[PDB]
RNA sequence: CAGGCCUUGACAUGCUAGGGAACCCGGGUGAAAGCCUGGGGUGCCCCGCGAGGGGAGCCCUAGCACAGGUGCUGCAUGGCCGUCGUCAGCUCGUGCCGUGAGGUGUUGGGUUAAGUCCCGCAACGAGCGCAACCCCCGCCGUUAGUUGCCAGCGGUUCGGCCGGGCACUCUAACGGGACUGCCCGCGAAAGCGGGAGGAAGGAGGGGACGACGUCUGGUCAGCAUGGCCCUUACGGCCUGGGCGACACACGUGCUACAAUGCCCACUACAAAGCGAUGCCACCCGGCAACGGGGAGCUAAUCGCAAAAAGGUGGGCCCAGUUCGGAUUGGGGUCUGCAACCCGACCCCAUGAAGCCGGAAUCGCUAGUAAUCGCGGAUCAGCCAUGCCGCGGUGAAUACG
RNA sequence: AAUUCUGA
């Protein structure tokens, strides 16, 4: 009954911040639906190496936006605790609705 | 005219972002700038202790500013005034949570970014640019390290025609990802021109 | 089936159909292997590298 | 002629058209990516230095 | 042809729409 | 007279006008040119005279 | 191509209106070539600029729907 | 092909007569990879065989191909500043390549409107031994044997 | 050699007129028209002794 | 570039002197810049009701130390990039030979993609490179279910949409896997050939990565920087023009010269991306561009959206053509203050050269070439036929 | 059976 978005760049922080928030409520009230990983939005833009000109031999960079999703069913009141109160963001976006 | 940046090369593993946080396609810009000017003023009023890195985190209107150093006793002063006067400056351009760490280095001669600046100085100090390398390496190597390497650019000594002074020891495989090598670069402007300081420190593995 | 192009899906169908009966049947190997309807076919339109109009084709060399 | 320009570059007034791009690090004006508000040079530079959040050497 | 503005491929190749290539 | 390999060997032209001579007169003389030789192999630096 | 209005520079109209009311002189420099030759303008000789100078161009009622740049070639060798 | 002696590409059977040859021929008829169209034409033609003749397509297409394969050909050569055109047998693998090719090429050197017709007619003649493809064959043979002089080189 | 009365350089952009001493920094401009400057001077130098 | 203008200046640090100290509305001349000009009007440091003051944020004028310079020098330089070359190479330590330069190792026999490995050997090791760890695509599993699905049944407004349910597909992040290990042969070995199994061989197909060095290679105009030089102008502002000129020549490309074709109506099959003064569902007026209204969308949940070649039917019937769309006249939409130089589209009318291209000359060895269509960055719009990506159909040939 | 490449 509660939809949560964890939009970060690295996954080694989402597949650890999500799976952390999961059983931090699973065991404290109604069950939950695992972390559903949705498609990534990337920025595969390229750029020409040399400063001056050399429209060939370039180098491109991409900016990956990894998205994690977890939905706790029955919105316990024993959950607006270790969750709504215990936050562990270090460089991650979190947006929750219902 | 080649060779990628060992740093940007390992950007996904064996070395991590010197600034990790999230930003939407709506502010990443302003914030990216912010992080920049921060490093700017910092690299200004903080050379006496000569840093070697400036990590920065976020998650909700906060700032790490975890300034790793090799002489923190200076960034602070005599108790906690310098470190206190600075937190002051930083917040002056950002109405944010201007935190500020002050790590250190158990051995700065195992952190290129520093070794670089050292020689940079020596050059501007009019030192034997050759031995100044022989030593800047015989140091890091003497103090344990699977690899050293310092490269200086043109104007070596002031001779009209520019030359590149090389010299290294140990092992330095810029082609092996899992090798965590420390790349250190810093300028050394003189009366006759500019010089280049490149240092390679080989550390970890597997 | 979905995704790709008809004369490309037909080829995938030839995989499932060749994997359906091999499952629900024994005598479907020593005569489906030397035919390999079981193979995958790595062949995929490859990435277009930079400085090459069509992935492998190159720009017109002049010299003059 | 580089300084006084990026200075008039900042001012975004007078006719909403002239308002143009411009790299922030360097004063450049060409190939100024909108995302980083940076140019194609002061992008390959920082990126390698890791200083660009999440921007990793693309490879596919 | 891919250049005959007044045709199917005309606008297709053009990427535009008109009396010769309406939107459904 | 478009010389051998490059340039010319001779040239002569009329200057129709007033005081044309008085103008193009001080020009009369030797004119040197220094730059790496576009002709020389290693684009080395040589001097030219005319 | 501008079916809404005539976008004809004002400093020019304001000019050919007071100077128009009770028709008189003509010495009228400008840089408003960008503007249209609104009807009536006939007579008054505009001296359109061209990046170099003011070319005294007459005004006939055959060149009304036309601009002013179209009466002062910018290049040389026309 | 400086290292390995390359490796002959293997075709896929025909979705009608199930023949490796019958397919190779279609590829030639193919333009811009439009195999779907190339394929059509062939059969569209194989029908014409029936139409105009009691012959049986697959067997007609078999005799034709045979009467176009050049016994021998003259490949260039270097004697030393000398390019004496020497004669030589035509590898079966190549023999068929040429054969098939000339057919199509010639097939188009016909004045017929449709294509099928061309492919058709062109095979109805060849199979007999009087087509444009056969001419451009005899020729390729007249050269050789005619140069049977410088044939003591072969190499 | 040593007979020139005004040299032209391009890898150091300038034009030294030995006769008078004058030295501009635009060889490219001179070599294309720009002369009305050194022509006057050229005279002044010369006509000086007559 | 022409023309009108500004001076410690469009930007910084700092100093002397009254006015001014936040700031707002204007009037005049003018192409704009600028010049010139009339009114509303301030907490405060604080003796003090007050008269009054100094005065910090603050801000104008005259004068000053300095700014500013895409002005020269890439042979004064940093950094970065091209290139030989994704080539098999380049060297060091000690020992040994040599008067010495140097040699040896690294040469030789065998193998490989490789200085890859093997065996020899006055050499014995090691370092920088090849390889390998990183990414992507091929099989598979686990974690995970708002993509998906009558897959099993059900109601169904008969649309996977509704209960239901994640089996599949897919999504994403961690793994299993291939190692010449197994059989036969030759071989001293390395390793090559042939077979089985397996999604896949023997580097599985793509990347990223590009050694010591070469080119006094490229860039002082992205930035940085030594020296030289301009400092009421080599700085600065604005309006207009130019960079888009045209007797010409070259490189790179687009569309064609047409029946394996073109035109038309109908009907399918994608991938990777991008989107809150952004993408626009659907309506509605219009031949249309497009303009009116208007819903959803922090976007696996709405939109750009149609993929196109293909398939079905029909129309041309061999012609400068129902081929080809240049040029030009006329009428319109839209962005922008404004499109004459100089915008992109739309519609009516023109319909040019071009019936396969001289000497020459380029690319590609397989999902490659050829061919069809889509996306993005840039960005108001757009001169994109460019560049960087994505998939759809899918060849020929390799003796040497 | 096919030349020449000045001079920092
Ligand atoms: Mg350098
Ligand atoms: Mg393709
Ligand atoms: Mg080239
Ligand atoms: Mg300027
Ligand atoms: Mg200027
Ligand atoms: Mg703009
Ligand atoms: Mg002579
Ligand atoms: Mg003579
Ligand atoms: Mg063959
Ligand atoms: Mg002027
Ligand atoms: Mg040079
Ligand atoms: Mg050995
Ligand atoms: Mg040796
Ligand atoms: Mg091998
Ligand atoms: Mg090795
Ligand atoms: Mg500069
Ligand atoms: Mg202009
Ligand atoms: Mg241009
Ligand atoms: Mg609207
Ligand atoms: Mg226009
Ligand atoms: Mg041809
Ligand atoms: Mg053609
Ligand atoms: Mg001769
Ligand atoms: Mg001679
Ligand atoms: Mg010589
Ligand atoms: Zn920049």
């Amino acid at each position: 009954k509660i939809r949560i978005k964890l939009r970060g760049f690295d996954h080694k922080t989402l597949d650890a911040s999500a799976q952390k928030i999961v059983e931090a409520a699973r065991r404290s009230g109604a069950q939950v639906s695992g972390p559903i990983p949705l498609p990534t939005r990337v920025r595969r833009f390229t750029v020409i190496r040399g400063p001056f000109k050399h429209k060939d031999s370039r180098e491109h960079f991409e900016l990956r936006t990894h998205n994690r999703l977890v939905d706790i069913i029955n919105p316990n009141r024993k959950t607006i605790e270790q969750l709504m109160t215990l936050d562990l963001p270090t460089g991650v976006e979190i947006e929750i609705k219902t | 005219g080649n060779k990628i940046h060992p740093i940007g090369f390992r950007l996904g593993i064996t070395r991590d972002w010197e600034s990790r946080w999230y930003a939407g396609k709506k502010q990443y810009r302003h914030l990216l700038l912010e992080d920049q000017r921060i490093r700017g003023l910092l690299e200004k009023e903080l050379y006496s202790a000569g840093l070697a890195r400036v990590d920065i985190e976020r998650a909700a209107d906060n700032v790490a500013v975890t300034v790793h150093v090799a002489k923190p006793g200076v960034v602070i002063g005599r108790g906690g005034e310098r470190i206190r006067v600075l937190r002051e400056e930083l917040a002056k351009l950002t109405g944010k949570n201007v935190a500020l760490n002050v790590q250190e280095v158990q051995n700065p001669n195992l952190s290129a970014p520093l070794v670089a600046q050292r020689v940079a100085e020596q050059i501007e100090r009019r030192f034997a640019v050759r031995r100044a390398i022989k030593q800047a390496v015989q140091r890091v190597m003497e103090s344990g390290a699977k690899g050293a390497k310092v490269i200086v650019s043109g104007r070596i000594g002031g001779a009209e025609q520019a030359r590149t002074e090389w010299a290294a020891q140990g092992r330095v495989p810029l082609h092996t990802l899992r090798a965590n090598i420390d790349y250190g670069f810093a300028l050394a402007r003189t009366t006759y021109g500019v010089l280049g300081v490149k240092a390679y420190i080989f550390l970890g593995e597997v | 089936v979905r995704g790709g192009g008809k004369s490309g899906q037909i080829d995938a169908i030839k995989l499932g159909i060749a994997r359906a009966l091999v499952q629900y049947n024994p005598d479907y190997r020593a005569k489906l292997k030397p035919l390999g309807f079981l193979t995958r076919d790595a062949r995929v339109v490859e990435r277009k590298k930079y400085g090459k109009h069509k992935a492998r084709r190159a720009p017109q060399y002049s010299k003059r | 002629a580089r300084k006084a320009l990026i200075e008039k570059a900042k001012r975004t007034p007078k006719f909403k058209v002239r308002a143009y791009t411009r790299c922030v690090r360097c004063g450049r004006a060409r190939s100024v990516y909108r995302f980083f508000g940076l140019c194609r040079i002061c992008l390959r530079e920082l990126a390698h230095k890791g200083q660009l959040p999440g921007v990793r050497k693309a490879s596919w | 042809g891919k250049g005959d503005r007044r045709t199917r491929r005309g606008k297709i190749w053009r990427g535009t729409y008109g009396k010769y290539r309406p939107r459904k | 007279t478009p010389g051998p390999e490059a340039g010319i060997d001779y040239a002569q032209i009329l200057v129709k006008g007033e005081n044309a001579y008085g103008l193009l007169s001080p020009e009369a003389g030797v004119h040197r040119l220094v730059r790496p030789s576009p002709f020389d192999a290693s684009g080395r630096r040589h001097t030219s005279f005319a | 191509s501008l079916k809404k209005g005539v976008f004809v520079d004002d400093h020019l109209l304001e000019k050919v209106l007071e100077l128009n009311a009770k028709g008189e002189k003509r010495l009228i420099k400008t840089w408003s070539r960008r503007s249209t030759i609104v009807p009536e303008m006939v007579g008054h000789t505009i001296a359109v600029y061209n990046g170099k100078q003011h070319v005294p161009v007459y005004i006939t009622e055959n060149m009304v729907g036309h601009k002013l740049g179209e009466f002062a070639p910018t290049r040389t060798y026309r | 092909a400086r290292r390995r002696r390359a490796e002959v590409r293997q075709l896929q059977p025909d979705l009608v007569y199930g023949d490796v040859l019958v397919t190779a021929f279609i590829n030639k008829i193919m333009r811009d990879g439009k195999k779907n169209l190339a394929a059509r034409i062939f059969y569209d033609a194989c029908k014409i065989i029936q139409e105009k003749t009691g012959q049986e397509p697959l067997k007609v297409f078999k005799q034709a191909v045979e009467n176009v394969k050049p016994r021998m050909e003259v490949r260039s050569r270097r004697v030393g500043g000398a390019n004496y055109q020497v004669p030589m047998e035509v590898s079966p693998r190549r023999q068929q390549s040429l054969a098939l090719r000339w057919l199509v090429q010639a097939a188009n050197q016909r004045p017929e409107r449709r294509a099928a017709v061309r492919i058709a007619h062109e095979l109805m003649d060849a199979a007999e031994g009087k087509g444009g493809a056969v001419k451009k064959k005899e020729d390729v043979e007249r050269m050789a044997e005619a140069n049977r002089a410088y044939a003591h080189y072969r190499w | 050699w040593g007979s020139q009365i005004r040299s032209y350089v391009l890898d150091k952009n300038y034009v030294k007129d030995h006769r008078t001493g004058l030295m501009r920094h635009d060889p490219e401009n001179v070599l294309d028209g720009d002369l009305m400057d050194l022509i006057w001077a050229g005279l002044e130098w010369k006509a000086g002794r007559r």
Side-chain angles (χ1 to χ4, degrees):
Chain A
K1 201 175 187 59
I2 299 185
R3 187 144 55 185
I4 76 171
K5 293 285 184 181
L6 301 184
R7 317 195 304 294
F9 290 162
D10 183 6
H11 55 183
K12 291 194 172 185
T13 74
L14 296 204
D15 278 49
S17 66
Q19 184 190 59
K20 180 282 299 181
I21 290 185
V22 175
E23 296 187 58
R26 269 181 165 295
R27 168 201 41 55
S28 63
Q31 306 176 303
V32 188
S33 64
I36 45 180
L38 51 174
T40 299
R41 302 297 285 284
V42 186
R43 285 301 186 63
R44 295 185 189 180
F45 51 62
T46 311
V47 131
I48 26 289
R49 299 221 183 201
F52 197 42
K53 53 203 57 170
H54 273 293
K55 251 291 231 287
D56 293 294
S57 87
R58 317 187 193 186
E59 181 177 13
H60 25 200
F61 308 128
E62 47 176 51
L63 187 63
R64 297 170 167 182
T65 264
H66 307 191
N67 296 293
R68 221 80 306 178
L69 184 63
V70 187
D71 278 37
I72 48 183
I73 53 172
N74 174 59
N76 310 298
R77 287 300 176 296
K78 295 167 50 50
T79 52
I80 310 296
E81 194 164 357
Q82 313 94 56
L83 310 172
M84 186 79 95
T85 79
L86 174 66
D87 293 299
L88 299 66
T90 170
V92 179
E93 180 70 348
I94 57 293
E95 296 300 2
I96 291 66
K97 274 301 179 178
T98 41
Chain B
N2 43 309
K3 309 181 190 299
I4 41 61
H5 199 182
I7 298 300
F9 187 41
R10 315 299 203 306
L11 238 293
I13 183 178
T14 322
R15 166 67 102 289
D16 291 356
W17 277 264
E18 190 192 4
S19 201
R20 38 205 168 192
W21 40 276
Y22 179 89
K25 67 171 188 297
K26 303 177 179 295
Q27 299 199 186
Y28 193 117
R29 177 165 49 185
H30 318 285
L31 312 173
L32 181 57
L33 153 137
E34 187 181 303
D35 267 5
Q36 291 293 72
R37 35 196 40 168
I38 293 178
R39 291 198 182 65
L41 184 58
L42 265 168
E43 291 172 55
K44 285 185 177 62
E45 287 187 58
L46 209 63
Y47 182 52
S48 301
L51 54 164
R53 184 186 169 193
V54 179
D55 195 63
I56 291 188
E57 293 188 300
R58 297 189 186 191
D61 298 60
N62 61 296
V63 200
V65 199
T66 312
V67 177
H68 302 285
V69 185
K71 199 176 190 66
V74 194
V75 304
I76 315 173
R78 58 174 189 173
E81 322 100 66
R82 182 67 172 298
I83 183 176
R84 212 73 168 176
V85 301
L86 294 181
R87 303 178 189 298
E88 180 49 60
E89 321 310 73
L90 308 181
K92 282 192 179 57
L93 43 62
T94 314
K96 278 179 172 295
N97 189 296
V98 293
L100 178 160
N101 280 287
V102 184
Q103 310 303 298
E104 193 185 62
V105 187
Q106 266 58 63
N107 194 312
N109 310 313
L110 288 177
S111 167
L114 307 163
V115 198
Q117 294 163 292
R118 185 180 188 63
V119 174
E121 294 174 47
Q122 291 189 63
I123 283 178
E124 315 187 306
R125 297 181 181 300
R126 293 67 182 302
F127 280 39
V129 195
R130 197 75 229 292
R131 76 182 313 190
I133 295 294
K134 289 285 191 178
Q135 276 160 43
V137 168
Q138 178 48 50
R139 184 206 317 299
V140 180
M141 277 298 276
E142 187 169 56
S143 78
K146 292 294 182 181
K149 180 181 173 185
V150 194
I151 298 173
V152 202
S153 61
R155 299 261 53 177
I156 303 174
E160 197 164 57
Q161 182 52 56
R163 303 182 304 81
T164 259
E165 200 54 60
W166 182 59
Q169 187 181 183
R171 302 197 306 83
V172 190
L174 303 68
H175 274 198
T176 322
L177 287 306
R178 61 153 204 184
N180 175 60
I181 296 179
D182 195 2
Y183 178 75
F185 168 61
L187 279 300
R189 64 207 70 183
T190 62
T191 318
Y192 51 63
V194 170
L195 276 291
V197 188
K198 289 190 178 187
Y200 291 72
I201 303 287
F202 183 48
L203 304 174
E205 229 170 304
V206 195
Chain C
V1 56
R2 288 146 56 276
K6 293 180 180 176
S7 185
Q9 294 163 171
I10 307 176
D11 304 285
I13 282 180
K14 175 181 287 58
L15 190 293
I17 290 297
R19 175 170 297 171
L21 39 58
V22 65
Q23 179 190 64
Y24 261 61
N25 250 292
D27 293 298
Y28 292 51
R29 196 77 183 189
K31 43 72 64 184
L32 198 73
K33 153 193 288 295
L35 263 297
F37 291 61
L38 238 148
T39 294
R40 226 333 297 271
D41 210 20
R43 296 151 53 176
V44 275
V45 176
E46 75 157 51
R47 173 197 179 193
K48 185 198 81 69
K49 291 78 174 200
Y50 55 174
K52 300 293 173 68
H53 290 294
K54 271 183 60 292
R56 265 184 174 169
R57 199 204 183 307
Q60 274 286 290
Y61 180 14
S62 302
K63 177 182 193 177
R64 66 261 293 190
Chain D
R2 174 200 71 279
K3 187 60 173 298
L5 276 183
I6 74 180
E7 194 60 55
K8 185 176 62 185
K10 286 188 176 183
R11 302 142 58 188
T12 305
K14 242 290 191 175
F15 295 119
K16 73 180 182 183
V17 184
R18 288 164 193 175
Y20 64 100
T21 338
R22 194 73 102 183
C23 183
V24 188
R25 289 198 64 194
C26 74
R28 205 201 186 76
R30 269 181 166 56
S31 62
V32 179
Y33 283 72
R34 302 181 64 167
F35 190 88
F36 307 55
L38 298 172
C39 86
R40 81 94 180 301
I41 306 180
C42 287
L43 177 161
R44 200 171 81 101
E45 286 192 355
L46 298 177
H48 285 56
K49 284 178 166 56
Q51 287 186 54
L52 295 171
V55 181
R56 178 184 172 188
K57 216 302 184 182
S59 173
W60 79 86
Chain E
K2 295 184 196 177
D4 202 318
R5 282 188 167 181
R6 293 180 172 185
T7 45
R8 183 54 60 185
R9 278 193 178 182
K11 276 73 155 56
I12 287 190
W13 187 88
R14 225 64 171 176
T16 70
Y17 299 81
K19 168 189 172 182
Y20 300 78
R21 181 203 179 183
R23 304 199 174 193
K24 187 183 289 70
Chain F
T1 320
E5 293 178 53
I8 56 182
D9 256 298
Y10 194 96
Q12 188 195 89
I13 59 170
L14 193 55
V15 183
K16 297 180 183 178
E18 75 309 300
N19 308 294
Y21 172 55
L23 308 190
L24 306 179
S25 55
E27 285 308 297
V30 180
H31 295 192
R32 198 174 71 167
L33 170 290
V34 182
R35 95 210 177 195
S37 292
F39 305 128
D40 181 300
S42 61
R44 218 163 58 184
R45 184 182 189 181
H46 288 293
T47 294
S48 314
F49 287 69
Chain G
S1 308
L2 276 280
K3 69 317 300 167
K4 236 60 56 54
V6 176
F7 64 95
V8 50
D9 279 1
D10 290 65
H11 58 278
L12 227 290
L13 279 75
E14 190 183 307
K15 205 85 63 180
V16 193
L17 301 180
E18 297 179 356
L19 290 286
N20 124 59
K22 299 183 176 182
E24 303 105 306
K25 252 296 193 306
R26 68 73 187 167
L27 192 174
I28 185 172
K29 303 212 301 179
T30 179
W31 288 265
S32 66
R33 54 189 307 170
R34 353 126 60 172
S35 55
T36 298
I37 302 177
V38 186
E40 173 274 73
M41 278 57 268
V42 314
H44 310 305
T45 44
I46 286 64
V48 183
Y49 191 65
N50 67 292
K52 199 171 185 180
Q53 73 160 63
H54 297 291
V55 296
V57 44
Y58 194 86
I59 194 72
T60 183
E61 52 187 65
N62 291 60
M63 58 173 135
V64 171
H66 295 291
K67 304 304 183 61
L68 284 199
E70 308 176 61
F71 297 104
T74 48
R75 305 182 175 68
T76 329
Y77 196 60
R78 310 315 321 184
Chain H
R2 202 191 292 288
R3 290 179 177 292
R4 266 84 169 190
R5 186 185 171 187
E7 274 176 355
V8 189
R9 178 165 299 249
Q10 193 51 64
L11 288 177
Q12 179 183 173
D14 186 19
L15 301 170
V16 179
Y17 294 70
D19 196 302
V20 293
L21 182 64
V22 175
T23 64
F25 183 64
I26 301 186
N27 290 300
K28 307 308 305 183
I29 340 292
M30 188 172 79
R31 306 202 184 308
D32 306 303
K34 297 170 68 68
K35 191 184 198 66
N36 196 52
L37 176 44
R40 284 170 162 288
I41 305 178
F42 184 31
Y43 305 161
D44 300 354
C46 314
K47 197 174 190 178
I48 294 299
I49 265 287
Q50 298 300 60
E51 289 291 3
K52 288 187 179 177
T53 180
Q55 314 291 298
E56 39 288 0
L58 186 58
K59 199 63 195 72
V60 173
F61 174 67
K62 181 63 175 62
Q63 186 163 56
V65 166
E66 194 60 8
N67 292 316
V68 174
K69 290 182 184 181
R71 211 81 181 189
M72 314 161 280
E73 66 171 352
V74 281
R75 290 187 72 72
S76 181
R77 177 65 197 296
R78 258 298 180 67
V79 184
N83 297 299
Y84 302 166
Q85 295 192 61
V86 202
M88 43 200 286
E89 304 177 3
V90 198
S91 179
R93 302 171 291 183
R94 177 180 181 68
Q95 198 155 183
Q96 187 180 304
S97 305
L98 296 163
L100 296 176
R101 197 183 311 169
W102 296 336
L103 264 302
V104 181
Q105 316 198 81
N108 301 291
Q109 286 183 52
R110 266 174 161 286
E112 352 291 308
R113 314 292 232 196
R114 305 154 61 179
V117 276
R118 287 202 295 288
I119 294 294
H121 305 182
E122 186 66 45
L123 280 164
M124 291 179 89
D125 292 15
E128 212 170 311
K130 66 177 189 65
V134 192
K135 179 177 180 178
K136 296 180 61 179
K137 160 228 175 188
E138 307 181 8
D139 176 56
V140 182
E141 298 188 59
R142 290 171 179 173
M143 309 283 254
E145 154 288 304
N147 297 201
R148 181 167 178 172
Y150 314 99
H152 54 301
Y153 292 169
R154 293 187 296 293
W155 102 314
Chain I
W1 298 90
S3 54
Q4 350 73 300
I5 66 164
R6 167 207 309 159
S7 297
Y8 302 57
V9 305
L10 290 163
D11 67 328
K12 301 281 170 283
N13 275 180
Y14 77 73
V15 182
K16 156 78 170 164
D17 192 292
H18 300 62
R19 271 176 311 166
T20 170
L22 196 174
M23 174 187 96
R24 297 168 58 171
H25 291 72
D26 61 313
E28 80 305 306
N29 262 298
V30 191
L31 304 188
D32 199 52
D34 296 53
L35 286 176
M36 285 297 272
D37 289 5
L38 41 181
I39 308 178
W40 293 149
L43 303 179
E44 311 181 12
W45 174 63
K46 293 193 170 181
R49 41 269 297 180
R50 302 163 190 164

